[PDB]
Amino acid sequence: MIQIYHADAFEIIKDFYQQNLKVDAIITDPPNFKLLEWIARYAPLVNPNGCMVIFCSYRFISYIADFLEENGFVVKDFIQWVKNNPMPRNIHRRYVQDTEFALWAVKKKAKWVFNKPKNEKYLRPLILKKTKHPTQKSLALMEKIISIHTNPNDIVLDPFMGSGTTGLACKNLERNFIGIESEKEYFQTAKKRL
Amino acid sequence: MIQIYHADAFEIIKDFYQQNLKVDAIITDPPYNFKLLEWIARYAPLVNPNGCMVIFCSYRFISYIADFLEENGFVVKDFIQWVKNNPMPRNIHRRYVQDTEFALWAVKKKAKWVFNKPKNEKYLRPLILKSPVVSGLEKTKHSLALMEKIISIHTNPNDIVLDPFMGSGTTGLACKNLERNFIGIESEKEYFQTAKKRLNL
Ligand SMILES: C[S@@+](CC[C@H](N)C(=O)[O-])C[C@H]1O[C@@H](n2cnc3c(N)ncnc32)[C@H](O)[C@@H]1O
Ligand SMILES: C[S@@+](CC[C@H](N)C(=O)[O-])C[C@H]1O[C@@H](n2cnc3c(N)ncnc32)[C@H](O)[C@@H]1O
């Protein structure tokens, strides 16, 4: 199944509460700032064996990890993605920025999903190199995230979906996506890409 | 130059205060209520106008360290990171292997900092090394080529590098081979003396 809503994630959670909605994994790329709050409100929706994968900057990453663990989750690890072709800035005075961070947490007593192909170890999921969106996470990245932390059909929820691409990864992997967007141009971008 | 002290860093910082000690770069690997973020507040005054800090941390502490650093008059430029060629591995089938070590790079606020990129172009992952063997000693917080690359980048040959928690002295030894003028402190004597034997008494 694929459902996209054009809504504010913070008010639409009340509808999901009454409906007793329960999703397997929350895989999202979030944008006086909380941003820790949505986590508190979307945490109840996760099934006992479920997990979260949350994109974040390293400036916020420790906060989110600690916050997650106050909400009944255990932060298992970090995942990260590197582009092969950074547009270089201040090459001589500073490190180029090729890296994107995400946090992987699971529910506290959960028996979670991992899925390693016959192969060994892990932890930099991808080597990777479309939309008009300002910040879009790529498809191949999202597809790998999903192949790992979810199973052939699980219910994946992305409260901030942007251009989608969390869904598109789910659709291609047959992963049952639900997603939300507040603004109309992004919602429709996500909609016809699906 | 190489000088090592055996002391509690929080106890020796007062001595450094009145001794008017000034160090160019604090490159350290701290240990992990508290608030072992405070040493940062206390060791900040010792850093020269153009100086910098490099602080090893878990991704669980990295955001805290970053914000505190920037409250003490430093600007966080970036993070640096190291990957082992040889993870053990542990808990493979159920989990990610642990191959990574994180550190934070900040500079004093209006500083003209060092960096030093070789004519060779980019990253952000100073080194993927093999993890220590016959340089490997007796301590679990223990790597050298990493410290040498960290130093080759964020310091210049005659600068003064301070490691308030020096552990086995892997920062001192790196400084020595790169001719970098090391100062270091250690609380434990088995660690202090090993470092002392690594830097040639
Ligand atoms: C940082 S972007 C991530 C984009 C997405 N990961 C992609 O691949 O394109 C987060 C998105 O969440 C949307 N958003 C912001 N506030 C929201 C809210 N209150 N409720 C639902 N969506 C929101 C924004 O429109 C933004 O495009
Ligand atoms: C993470 S280890 C650093 C090890 C070192 N980087 C190495 O490669 O060998 C931190 C060290 O700081 C020491 N330590 C703990 N408290 C200290 C203090 N108050 N002052 C100085 N050193 C301390 C510990 O004994 C430990 O050896």
Author numbering:
A (entry chain B): 1 to 31, 59 to 156, 165 to 229
B (entry chain A): 1 to 32, 59 to 168, 173 to 231
Kindly provide excerpts from the paper associated with this entry.
M1.HpyAVI is a DNA adenine MTase that belongs to the type II R-M system. M1.HpyAVI encoded by ORF hp0050 is an N6-adenine methyltransferase belonging to the β-class MTase. It has been reported recently that this enzyme recognizes the sequence of 5′-GAGG-3′, 5′-GGAG-3′ or 5′-GAAG-3′ and methylates adenines in these sequences. The structural basis and the catalytic mechanism underlying such a distinct activity are not well understood due to the lack of an available 3D structure of this enzyme.Here, we report the crystal structure of M1.HpyAVI from H. pylori 26695, which is the first determined N6-adenine MTase structure in H. pylori.
The cofactor-free and AdoMet-bound proteins were crystallized at different conditions. Both structures were determined by means of molecular replacement, and refined to 3.0 Å and 3.1 Å, respectively. Four and eight protein monomers resided in the asymmetric units of the two crystal structures. The two structures are very similar to each other and could be well overlaid with an RMSD of 0.76 Å on 191 Cα atoms. The catalytic motif DPPY lies in a loop connecting αD and β4, and the cofactor AdoMet binds in a neighboring cavity. The cofactor binding pocket of M1.HpyAVI is surrounded by residues 7-9, 29-31, 165-167, 216-218 and 221, which are conserved among most of DNA MTases. A hydrogen bond between D29 in the catalytic motif DPPY and the amino group of bound AdoMet is preserved as other MTase structures. Residues D8 and A9 from hydrogen-bonds with N6 and N1 of the purine ring, respectively, and E216 also locates at hydrogen bonding distance with O2′ and O3′ of the ribose. In addition, H168, T200 and S198 contact the terminal carboxyl of AdoMet. The phenyl ring of F195 forms a perpendicular π-stacking interaction with the purine ring of AdoMet, which stabilizes the orientation of AdoMet bound in the pocket of M1.HpyAVI.
